[PDB]
Symmetry: D2
């Protein structure tokens, strides 16, 4: 399966007690495939509230997403953790389910050396036999990987490239220059246009769960050099994203899904579980203005 193009970072529907709501999760998967018209789903990322969940819950989500998606789209499994044994267990399970690639966040909390980081990727790859996408998110992890360091990771032929949720466009250019055959997915939806201008191969985004139509337009128009139109659509997109961030990122994407009849559920504690009535009214304004 071609892993280029537009991937939603899959949100998960939770019940009030924090358990997975399977019906709701399935409705989110279907909405992304049928209505957002994504090329793929990136499952178990930050957006899936993954790091607040048990290993069993993470397995449940992988199972559900794949059973619902079947073979209609590409599927990437984020299996990274501070616990390398958990990552390997999850990696094996997603690979056995048929996920097209794994991805793994750089290990965090502790200050791991680069050799420890490389061994972590190499271990998951060896144990699973699957492809690997390096998940880079400096603003959450505090981990910054340089161009030489990416080169060392890329010595393993099963590393396909990087989910680049980072704002350094000089690094972004140098990585494309140095490793032209390795892939890059942009991770900041509000910076899609300038990333696409530097030749990234796709994008993985939480806002694509509701704004997938615009996201594809910006990407395809930019690659075609229709910059004036791409920019107009990036401007509207970012008015919507600005509102979503101000109101509460995951809760507001979910409220926007609910407004279209998707049972997107609660957020998982210790995140705030439910929007206040004021913020629900704010999310309705965003719906009326940008997604009607």
């Amino acid at each position: 399966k071609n892993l280029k193009g537009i991937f939603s970072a899959l949100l998960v529907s939770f019940n009030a007690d924090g358990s997975i709501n399977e019906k709701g999760l399935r409705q989110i998967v279907r909405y992304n495939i049928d209505k957002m018209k994504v090329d793929g789903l990136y499952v178990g990322g930050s957006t899936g509230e993954n790091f607040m969940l048990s290993t069993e819950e993470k397995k449940e989500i992988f199972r559900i997403a794949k059973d619902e998606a079947k073979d209609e789209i590409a599927l990437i499994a984020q299996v990274g953790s501070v616990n390398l044994q958990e990552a390997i267990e999850l990696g094996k399970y997603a690979t056995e389910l048929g996920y097209d690639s794994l991805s793994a966040v750089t290990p965090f909390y502790y200050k791991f050396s680069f050799p420890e980081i490389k061994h972590y990727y190499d271990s998951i790859i060896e144990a699973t036999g699957n492809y690997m996408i390096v998940y880079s998110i400096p603003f959450l992890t505090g981990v910054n990987i340089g161009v030489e360091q990416f080169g060392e990771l890329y010595k393993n032929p099963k590393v396909l490239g990087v989910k680049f949720t980072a704002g350094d466009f000089y690094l972004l250019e140098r990585l494309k220059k140095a490793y032209p055959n390795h892939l890059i997915w942009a991770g900041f939806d509000e910076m899609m246009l300038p990333a696409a201008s530097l030749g990234v191969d796709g994008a993985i985004g939480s806002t694509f769960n509701v704004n997938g139509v615009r996201a594809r337009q910006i990407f395809e128009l930019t690659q075609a050099g229709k910059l004036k139109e791409a920019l107009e659509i990036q401007h509207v997109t970012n008015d919507l994203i600005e509102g979503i961030l101000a109101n509460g990122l995951y809760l507001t994407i979910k409220e926007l899904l609910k407004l279209d009849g998707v049972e997107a559920g609660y957020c998982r504690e210790p995140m705030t579980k439910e929007l206040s009535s004021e913020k629900v009214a704010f999310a309705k304004e965003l719906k009326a203005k940008y997604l009607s």
Copy 2:
């Protein structure tokens, strides 16, 4: 029980495959009680390599540590996690095992609001019925709590105080001024003297597993106003700690335990699991210089 004084942050003995070495873990516990003469153990913190382990492995460690220490010292169980349901489950287990207080790291990775942080602490306390010590470690978590926010957390009468592994001595003084009946444990071993000079109630440290004799001397002498002797002991201690840090923190403390007949074992991947031979020899030099 009295929770003041010197607490070692308990290191864990791992086998080559990353499983727990029960024999070796009870030896580290014994060495702390009998040879380091600590007031208590802080179990499942950063030093215990806790964040790289499964829920079951964390329970095992709590079980073994309590089974060995019995009633002889104070015991604090660090149960914090990005997963609040895990924290609750661990908090209940440790309470049922008889731990004298719980402690929990501020939830990390995601950027949680202060009301979400307070709700996390209040939830663990309500579910367990046990005491709580806030674990503050900004250099790992990126989370900074202010004096006013501590005041809000301390509105819950079961919050005893804070493990302050933080380098802001202005904040430290302000907290002791503002909340005189609440406890503070210093978390940076290499700054014990200046922290004790500001009236902290004890210390929780990784190096006390091997340097617990000097650590008690710095603390007790500083409190008695014997600054001359305390400083001399802090200088030697920091020669040892500078060496430990340069050679590899958890591995070098484990090696120093091994040199005293304690089966401290390997570190847990994704941490480097054993020292290079040259670094083994460096730790033997530290042992000769500072701990024989």
Copy 3:
């Protein structure tokens, strides 16, 4: 004069004792106009080694640059300082010489409040009667100005816009969306393409003193939607910039000028004043690969 387009941040030629070499400075001005084909010069910026100089030296550079350039190109005078009285003295002098606009760095070193920063700009504008361009360079100053704050600055109708030497492309987009008639000049030469993709109005850059031909090509091709070609030229440009940064930015640009018969002189202490012979040889390789 039109202030859009390509502006070199003017380097200055120093003698061995740190005094201005007039003959060399005029050669630099001429090279930029006649060979780099710039739209204008930005005089007295970081690149001019401005902050290491006396007030009289800054005035002599303004005087010389303007006498050499006459009315052939646009000229912007950076007059910012921690000293507001100095900034006003320089602003008046540059305005009297006929500079097309002033620019001023946000006052730095001390942690100024935003109302202090706004008063600083309004004060320079009132005293001089000239236009003003806000010079934003967070990586040197530690000052970060937000969208709402730019709006307060832009309440003064003499503020034309901002020199944006910063790497936050979400802010960049939001600024162009919120204040579409105010101008933005890109300040990071190695990020020109993605900046131009978002509709910046020009660029101010140190490397344009030698790479002005390619810099204009990237900028014009990007705005025309010729991204494939713009990206190829940005990749070569960045191979050159990477080498310049590794070798020493100001000295290396001066070395590349010298190789074309421009007497670009020494750098000013406390910067290193001269390249080593090894680094001169390195600059010759850059010349042979990228500028021959």
Copy 4:
């Protein structure tokens, strides 16, 4: 002259137009000598609003301060600048006025290399013949100097030690261990007690202009091992400092000087030049609570 002990960082009296008020500056010098009973004065540092002034103004301040103080106290002249030629000119002037030592902030704004920083210090020392105190203020300058780097600076026998306006007590202890004969002055007044516990040789502080009685008490009680007493006085001191910081640091110290009859005047633009009315009243409350 003995340079150990308590040094006020001299505040400067400005007129409404920003010019030096000589009468007010002499009154501040007198008040420090006669009422605060300081060991000495640190002239031309951040507290003196130095970096917002012209070279001539800085000279006037140095001349006036020495003329007023004569030989009654120690005097240190801060002459550092991004302009090394200015630093040398200022250093020569203060030296020939008879200042007991010079001091110089690490060059800032530009990202200077360590050999450039060392050459800056050696150059000022060579040109003046005077002793040098390294002025380290990381939170303003972003410059961090390590133990080994201080060793390299200390190879010049005229480098006496460091004004440590920094929060790292581990570094503080290491520097005192490594270079026992070199001096350290604490730069943060609100952390005087823990700095004194680690054996610093004195303190240089802005709040000593108004609170030098308690400052000397904390320093001396701490050095005698009377910690419970020192801590009490440190608590009251930090209540006053917390108020001062919240109300506006330099303006509020100046208001407290004015409330004791000293014509401490305005601050210099671009700093806010006078307190708002409500903040005048708050400063009055500080006077009544802590300095009456």
